[PDB]
């Protein structure tokens, strides 16, 4: 309800004041691009990205009021969706939607996209990226959206305390609405802009859903293709991820 003349910047300050910094993967580009070194690097990046998201999430407003197991759960799910989005925001402001900027030391160009044995999905991620430009997504809009994503995937069975969750997911959708509603007063373009982002958000689920199948399978024929897996990485992919596949855990789409 940002009305009057002041108040409300509070929320928008958090996301900004708590947005993780830069993250390196540890991939020496000065080496022949092989499916091994590549995927093995992205895997190392994933772990390195997880920790930040963890700290990042515990800083979120009202996030702490969530149950532990839940917090651990939720984070263990939408993690994929988030990273893809963040990475999308990186490739945009940086390589101006043309290359998959995963990390300073890891820039996915056409060639690598192929050698990664996953050129298909890469396109989708390079799509969601180009979208930021078209929809003219603003930083505030992103920082806010990325958060919402966190609470955008739960088991149809229900968390260990649904109420708190819904409440927060609720309060967050408003902030998104509160940010969108800060440029002019008219309940027209708002119902329009909101519709846009919401779509964008849901369009993330598919990719995630896709990037999941790939990593899981990769975990199976892991040793074969000789690709290392971080202690924490393999964990989620073998338990948490499978649930998303087994259908026990499902995303939360605004539309249909």
């Amino acid at each position: 309800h940002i009305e009057g003349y002041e108040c409300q910047p509070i929320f928008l300050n958090v996301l900004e004041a708590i947005e993780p910094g830069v993250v390196c993967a540890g991939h020496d580009n000065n080496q022949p691009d092989s499916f091994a070194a590549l995927l093995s690097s992205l895997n190392e990046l994933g772990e390195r990205q997880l920790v930040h998201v963890v700290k990042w999430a515990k800083a979120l407003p009202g996030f702490r009021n969530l149950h532990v197991d839940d917090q651990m759960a939720v984070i263990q799910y939408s993690w994929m969706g988030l990273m893809v989005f963040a990475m999308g925001w990186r490739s945009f402001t940086n390589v101006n939607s043309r290359m998959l900027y995963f990390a300073p030391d890891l820039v996915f160009n056409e060639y690598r996209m192929h050698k990664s044995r996953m050129y298909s999905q890469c396109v989708r991620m390079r799509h969601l990226s180009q979208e930021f430009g078209w929809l003219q997504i603003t930083p505030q809009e992103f920082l806010c959206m990325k958060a919402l994503l966190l609470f955008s995937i739960i088991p149809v069975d229900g968390l260990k305390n649904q109420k708190f969750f819904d409440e927060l997911r609720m309060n967050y959708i408003k902030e998104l609405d509160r940010i969108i509603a800060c440029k002019r007063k008219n309940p027209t373009s708002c119902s329009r802009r909101f519709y846009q982002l919401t779509k964008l958000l849901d369009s993330v689920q598919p990719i995630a859903r896709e990037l999941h199948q790939f990593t899981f399978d990769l975990l199976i024929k892991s040793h074969m293709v000789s690709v290392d897996f971080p202690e924490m990485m393999a964990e989620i992919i073998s338990v948490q991820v499978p649930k998303i596949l087994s259908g026990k855990v499902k995303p939360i789409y605004f539309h249909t």
Partner: peptide, 9 residues
Amino acid sequence: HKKLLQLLT
């Protein structure tokens, strides 16, 4: 999980 719940604290 096990190795992650630690970071939550």
